[PDB]
Design a protein around this ligand. Structure first.
Ligand SMILES: *[C@@H]1O[C@H](CO)[C@@H](O[C@@H]2O[C@H](CO)[C@@H](O)[C@H](O)[C@H]2NC(C)=O)[C@H](O[C@H]2O[C@@H](C)[C@@H](O)[C@@H](O)[C@@H]2O)[C@H]1NC(C)=O
Ligand SMILES: *[C@@H]1O[C@H](CO)[C@@H](O[C@@H]2O[C@H](CO)[C@@H](O)[C@H](O)[C@H]2NC(C)=O)[C@H](O)[C@H]1NC(C)=O
Length: 351
């Protein structure tokens, strides 16, 4: 039983936003050369006064991205399908290189990479080495620091960056399947370093360290990093619950700035480290085999850092401290001891 506050008619971004009650959305179309819609929320301030939030472009798609996604079906309608996907990948890379995404283009880009990854899988087609590099460069471009606000916009409607991590893991597994036994490839870009290894069960005799630190062939930012994971050898033992014919694909990923966009799903909580991933297929027994993850802090003045892993069991899942012990090495570094495979990070309260 109170006054009903209304956001005034407004013209931000050359569109008419009609008078709209607090709590409600206004809708509009997208700029020229895009399709979809825009929306804008009217909200109530701490002091009970209506104000407009920023317009969302989460559902605007640039024409070139839409045309790209539609051309994918044309290539499907095995070799044709796979060569097709390689062309789509090349075209996506060129696009992401022009930047000037809409938020909706970030989402569309993930959807394209997802459809490309699923197509490779269904067609039993392994992309060539330059296609692998192109895929990673695309991801690195999507994760440009500049896109941070657009990702936040996109993520009002869909967990695009989580979906992107999943697409990255699936792609890694497709590539690993086509590798030789014992083969190890590093993918390096400005924002992402990935390691992919094919490892026969029982053949791993020492713990595996990622990323390798001793080489100047390694991109600067990662070589510099004090982030790393030690993967225990025992997890590569065959279990009757796997045998001498079993082969694991091990992927490990270090992200330079994925921390800027992954959701924390908690109030006054921030991601306070880079993001590190360890993925193994088929799944081994991991119980009582602890990965040791070392993560430098991003910022000082945080309350109580703690190790989490991504739990896939909506929002495509959540962060959990279940299965991780947090070791507070010093004010600037934390060591996580986790007996589950996943995406790892340090959260902390900012208050
Ligand atoms: C919207 O997209 C269209 C293409 O569908 C753009 O038209 C391009 O205009 C340039 C002008 O040099 C022309 O060389 C290109 O051939 C043409 N693109 C295509 C694919 O044919 C259009 O760009 C427009 O930008 C405005 C600011 C102005 O320079 C105008 O001349 C130009 O057409 C895009 N429109 C907007 C608003 O960016
Ligand atoms: C492209 O990816 C999307 C989502 O991963 C696939 O789904 C399309 O969109 C909705 C949402 O899932 C589905 O209900 C539709 O059936 C899909 N549309 C089409 C064109 O079938 C979509 O299947 C993928 N497309 C390709 C070429 O693999």
């Amino acid at each position: 039983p109170a006054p009903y506050e209304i956001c005034p008619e407004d013209y931000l971004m050359s569109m008419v936003w009609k008078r709209t009650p607090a709590g409600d959305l206004a809708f509009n179309q997208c700029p020229l050369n895009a399709t979809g819609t825009t929306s804008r929320r009217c909200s109530l301030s701490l002091h009970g006064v209506a104000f407009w939030e920023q317009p969302s472009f989460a559902r605007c798609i640039s024409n070139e991205y839409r045309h790209l996604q539609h051309s994918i079906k044309e290539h499907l309608a095995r070799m044709l399908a796979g060569d097709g996907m390689s062309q789509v990948t090349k075209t996506l890379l060129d696009l992401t290189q022009r930047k000037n995404f809409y938020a909706g283009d970030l989402l569309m880009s993930v959807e394209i990479l997802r459809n490309v990854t699923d197509t490779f899988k269904r067609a039993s087609y392994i992309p060539a080495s330059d296609g692998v590099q192109n895929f990673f460069q695309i991801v690195s471009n999507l994760l440009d620091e500049e896109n941070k606000e657009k990702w936040e916009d996109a993520q009002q409607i869909y967990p695009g960056s989580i979906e992107l991590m999943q697409v990255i893991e699936d792609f890694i597994h497709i590539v690993g399947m086509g590798m030789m036994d014992f083969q190890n490839s590093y993918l390096m870009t400005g924002n992402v370093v990935a390691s992919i290894q094919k490892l026969p069960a029982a053949s791993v005799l020492t713990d595996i360290n990622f990323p390798m630190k001793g080489r100047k062939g390694m991109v600067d930012w990662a070589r510099n990093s004090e982030d790393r994971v030690v993967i225990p050898k025992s997890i590569f033992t065959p279990v009757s619950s796997l045998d001498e014919s079993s082969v694991f694909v091990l992927g490990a990923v270090l992200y330079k700035n994925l921390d800027l966009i992954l959701p924390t799903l908690r109030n006054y909580t921030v991601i306070n480290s880079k993001i590190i991933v360890v993925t193994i297929r088929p799944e081994p027994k991991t119980t009582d085999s602890f990965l040791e993850i070392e993560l430098a802090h991003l910022a000082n003045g945080t309350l109580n850092p703690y190790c989490v892993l991504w739990d896939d069991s909506e929002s495509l899942g959540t962060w959990s401290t279940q299965g991780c012990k947090t070791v507070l090495t010093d004010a600037s570094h934390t060591k996580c001891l986790c007996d589950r495979l996943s995406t790892f990070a340090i959260l902390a309260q900012q208050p």
